[PDB]
């Protein structure tokens, strides 16, 4: 998968769990 969507997915994981 492309780098742009992947980093936004990791950002989504941080904010969903805090």
């Amino acid at each position, epitope marked *: 998968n492309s780098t742009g969507i992947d980093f*936004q997915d*990791e*950002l989504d994981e*941080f904010f969903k769990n805090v």
Partner: antibody, heavy 118, light 104 residues
Framework: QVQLVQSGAEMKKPGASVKISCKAS????????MHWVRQAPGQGLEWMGI????????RYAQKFQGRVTMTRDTPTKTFYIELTRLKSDDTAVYYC???????????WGQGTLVTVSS | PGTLSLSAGERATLSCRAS???????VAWYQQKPGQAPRLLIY???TRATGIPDRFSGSGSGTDFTLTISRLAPEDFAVYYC???????????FGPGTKVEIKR
């Protein structure tokens, strides 16, 4: 086309607070992380914080923790920064930026000069 | 951050001094011209941003990351910034700018 339009230049005395707006257009405003970046005249860029698309999640740079506040209002498609306890060091051009493509800074506002001085 | 002087068509290689291997490969490069907003050129160490010519390129691993301009076009002369970032916790840290100027 994505377009970010910030409010106009501001003049503030030391110790006062400032609130810049950033109005988005051309897209849903519901997908993108947003950032605030500032640049003192003749100096480098400095990241300040990030806001998730819902606006319920933020993460400021540690230098501005406790004095900055970022908010978002999807129905008005407006992005806000609120800096307080202003010092002369805070004189800078402030940029809003959208991370719709990479999560970084893909689209920029025109910027807003904030001059803190007595 | 020493200024670079070179003629058009020359090669330049900018380096970024990472801390703790940045993270994964999270380094990006921004270009800014006077009176203008910064423009992203490279992110993820090596993948180009939209509308950025192939003459720009990025590479590196560990603490050593690099932006190469294989040949400078007249429009490539500007200040260039390294951006180190991460996701958990989110953080975004610009490096000092490096001006690239026309040798004469």
């Amino acid at each position: 086309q994505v377009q970010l339009v910030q409010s106009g230049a501001e003049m503030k005395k030391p110790g006062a607070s400032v609130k810049i707006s950033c109005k988005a257009s051309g897209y849903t405003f519901t997908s993108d992380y947003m950032h605030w970046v500032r640049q003192a005249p003749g100096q480098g860029l400095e990241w300040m914080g990030i806001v998730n698309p819902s606006g319920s999640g933020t993460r400021y740079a540690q230098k501005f923790q406790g004095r900055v506040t970022m908010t978002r209002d999807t129905p008005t498609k407006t992005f806000y920064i609120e800096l307080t306890r202003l010092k002369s060091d805070d004189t800078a051009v402030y940029y809003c930026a959208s991370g719709i493509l990479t999560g970084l800074f893909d689209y920029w506002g025109q910027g807003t000069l904030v001059t803190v001085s007595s | 951050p020493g200024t670079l002087s070179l003629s058009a068509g020359e090669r330049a290689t900018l380096s970024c001094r990472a801390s703790q291997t940045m993270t994964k490969n999270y380094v990006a490069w921004y270009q800014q011209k006077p009176g203008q907003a910064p423009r992203l050129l490279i992110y993820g160490a090596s993948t180009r941003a939209t509308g950025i010519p192939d003459r720009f390129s990025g590479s590196g691993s560990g603490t050593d990351f690099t932006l190469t301009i294989s040949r400078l076009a007249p429009e490539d002369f500007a200040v260039y910034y390294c951006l180190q970032y991460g996701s958990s916790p989110p953080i975004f840290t610009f490096g000092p700018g490096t001006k690239v100027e026309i040798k004469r």
